[PDB]
C-alpha cells in the first residue's frame, strides 16, 4: 500500500514545515502512555514516552485524533501526542484485554449467565466526577513563593521581596511582575455551567468576588500564552494543597528555616508588632513544614541570600532553556 507511505511523507513534510512556527497552547498529561508503541500514530518510531504529570507544547492542528507537540525537557525534539478522544480510546483499550470489565465474574461460571455488557460497563456511566484526561493548563507554570510565615506580613514580605527584586534586576527586559489582589485559591473548573454570568441578577454569587477570580484566571492564562516568564505576588496563598488541585498548579518555591528558634529570634529583632502575631506565624510555619517536601516543586534551605537567589536563578534559567 503506497497510501501509508505517501501520508507518512506528507506528515513528515508538514512536520519540518511547522517546526519553526509559534506555539499555540499547552496541556498536561495525567496518564502514563507511550506514543511510539501505538500503531495509529501518523509517524511511527518518533513517539513521546511521557508519564504522569507531564507537559507538552502544542503548536498546530492535525485532526480530531492526534496533535503535534514538543517535549518540555531540554533537547526535546518533535513528537505526536494523541487527542483527548484518542486518549479516551486508548484508556478503554487498556482494560479491554482483561477477561471481564463489567459485573459478570469469570470464577468458573461460563455458559450459564451470558450477561451482555450494559451501559454501566461502558464509559457512559461513572460521570460523578469525570476527571478530564487532558486539562487546559497555562503554557508556563507560574512562579510563586511560599513561607516561611504568613503572606502580607513583614518577615515574608522582606524575604520574598528581596528575591523578587533580584529576579527583576537579573531578568530585565524578559520578565514581568504582577500582583494578584483577587483570590486565587478557588480556581475551580467543574462547579457549574456558568456561575454568575451577569452581575445585575443580584443572586447570592452574583455580588461575590468569583467573577474577579475567574477574570484573573483567564488573565494568568493569556499572560502565560505570551511565553514570557511571569511571577505572582499574590498574598492569598498559604499552603501547597490549596492550589495543588486547581488548573494553574503554580511552581511552589518553598523557603525553610532549620529551627523555629532562629525565626523566633528574627521576629525578636523586628519589633512588638510582629511579636503580636509571632504565635500565628509559628503555627503556620509548623503546619507548612509538616508537609513533605515533594508537594513543593523546589526547596531553599540556604541561610544566605546569595545561595538561594542564584539557585532559583539557574532553576529559572534551565526552565526557560528547556522550554525552547
Amino acid at each position: 500500500e503506497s497510501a501509508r507511505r505517501e501520508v507518512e511523507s506528507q506528515a513528515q513534510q508538514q512536520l519540518e514545515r511547522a517546526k519553526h512556527k509559534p506555539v499555540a497552547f499547552a496541556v498536561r498529561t495525567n496518564v502514563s502512555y507511550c506514543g511510539v508503541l501505538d500503531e495509529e500514530c501518523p509517524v511511527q518510531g518518533s513517539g513521546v514516552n511521557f508519564e504522569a504529570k507531564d507537559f507538552l507544547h502544542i503548536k498546530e492542528k492535525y485532526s480530531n485524533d492526534w496533535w503535534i507537540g514538543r517535549l518540555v525537557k531540554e533537547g526535546g525534539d518533535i513528537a505526536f501526542i494523541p487527542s483527548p478522544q484518542r486518549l479516551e480510546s486508548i484508556r478503554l483499550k487498556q482494560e479491554q484485554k482483561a477477561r471481564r470489565s463489567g459485573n459478570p465474574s469469570s470464577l468458573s461460571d461460563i455458559g450459564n449467565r451470558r450477561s451482555p455488557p450494559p451501559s454501566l460497563a461502558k464509559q457512559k456511566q461513572k460521570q460523578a466526577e469525570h476527571v478530564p484526561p487532558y486539562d487546559v493548563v497555562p503554557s508556563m507554570r507560574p512562579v510563586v513563593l511560599v513561607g516561611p510565615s504568613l503572606k502580607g506580613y513583614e518577615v515574608t514580605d522582606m524575604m520574598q521581596k528581596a528575591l523578587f527584586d533580584f529576579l527583576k534586576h537579573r531578568f530585565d527586559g524578559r520578565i514581568s511582575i504582577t500582583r494578584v489582589t483577587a483570590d486565587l485559591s478557588l480556581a475551580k473548573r467543574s462547579v457549574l455551567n456558568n456561575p454568575g454570568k451577569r452581575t445585575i441578577i443580584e443572586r447570592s454569587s452574583a455580588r461575590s468576588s468569583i467573577a474577579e477570580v475567574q477574570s484573573e484566571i483567564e488573565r494568568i492564562f493569556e499572560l502565560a500564552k505570551s511565553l514570557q516568564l511571569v511571577v505572582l505576588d499574590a498574598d492569598t496563598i498559604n499552603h501547597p494543597a490549596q492550589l495543588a488541585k486547581t488548573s494553574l498548579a503554580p511552581i511552589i518555591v518553598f523557603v525553610k528555616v532549620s529551627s523555629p528558634k532562629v525565626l523566633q529570634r528574627l521576629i525578636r529583632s523586628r519589633g512588638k508588632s510582629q511579636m503580636k502575631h509571632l504565635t500565628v506565624q509559628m503555627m503556620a510555619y509548623d503546619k507548612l513544614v509538616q508537609c513533605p517536601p515533594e508537594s513543593f516543586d523546589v526547596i531553599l534551605d540556604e541561610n544566605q541570600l546569595e545561595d538561594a537567589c542564584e539557585h532559583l536563578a539557574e532553576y529559572l534559567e534551565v526552565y526557560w532553556r528547556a522550554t525552547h
Partner: peptide, 14 residues
C-alpha cells in the same frame, strides 16, 4: 543561621 537571616530581613525592604 541568624547571620544570613538578620540581613535578609534588613536590606530587602527595611
Amino acid at each position: 543561621d541568624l547571620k544570613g537571616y538578620l540581613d535578609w530581613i534588613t536590606q530587602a525592604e527595611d
